[PDB]
């Protein structure tokens, strides 16, 4: 599950549409300010697209 919870990772509200590397992380088109827990979940799935998940870790 989770061995640690970052308490100062939920209050953060990063922008997404300001840099072209993060502009592929938007799912709608009327969202620009997205909180960190949704952002770090989106960035996890984008990293799973870039590097795949080999079978030995699971």
């Amino acid at each position: 599950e989770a061995a640690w919870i970052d308490s100062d990772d939920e209050k953060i509200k990063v922008p997404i549409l300001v840099t072209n590397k993060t502009k592929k992380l938007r799912t709608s088109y009327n969202e620009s300010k997205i909180n960190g827990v949704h952002y770090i979940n989106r960035l996890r799935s984008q990293f799973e697209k870039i590097y795949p998940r080999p079978k030995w870790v699971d």
């Binding site: 990063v14 590397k21 993060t22 960035l43 870039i50």
Partner: protein
């Protein structure tokens, strides 16, 4: 005596005539390929 003739014949028939070329191990040309990576500036974020 027939077994020793048969053993001689088994040696004689197993003796191949033409050469058997082995497995060819030649290096292919390897080129640099475009591949993806990860950016750390999107991994960082600024406070509210």
């Amino acid at each position: 005596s027939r077994a020793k003739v048969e053993n001689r014949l088994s040696q004689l028939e197993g003796r191949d005539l033409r050469t058997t070329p082995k497995v060819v191990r030649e290096a292919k040309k390897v080129e640099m390929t475009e591949a993806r990576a990860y950016n750390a500036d999107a991994d960082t974020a600024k406070a509210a």
